[PDB]
Symmetry: C2
Subunit: 80 residues, 2 copies
């Protein structure tokens, strides 16, 4: 019942942080966690991807295709 | 003896193309393929990542941690 993810920002300022999420959580919750950790100011600025696919806010973490080999989410942040 | 990869550019102009590489090929060869496919003009402009880690030119494709779940390379292109 845990979805453990690494959240890695790939453009400066970079970061790599980890957290255990609930399967029932949404991608919005990952964004909110990034705001909580002072890695972003606004949800609208944050784009998350896995394997180069954009992960939209309403997607559930239980729908992420994560495996031991890759449970890393790529983080991009751009102004509105 | 084949390393099959998807190469996905995530900022506009986006693309997603596939190719079978040799294990002995380098990351430089992936970049050269992108130039060959008219997706970039210069090697120095191309950044490749997997799971949010930058893949430097001298890395061999046999050192990539690819699996059925993810054999997608994230492509970024930025001027010099």
């Amino acid at each position: 019942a845990a979805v453990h993810l690494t959240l890695k920002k790939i453009q400066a300022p970079k970061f790599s942080i980890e957290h255990d999420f609930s399967p029932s959580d949404t991608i919005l919750q990952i964004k909110q966690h990034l705001i909580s950790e002072e890695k972003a100011s606004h949800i609208s600025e944050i784009k998350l991807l896995l394997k180069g696919k954009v992960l939209h806010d309403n997607l559930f973490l239980s729908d992420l295709k994560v495996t031991p080999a890759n449970s890393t989410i790529t983080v991009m942040i751009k102004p509105n």
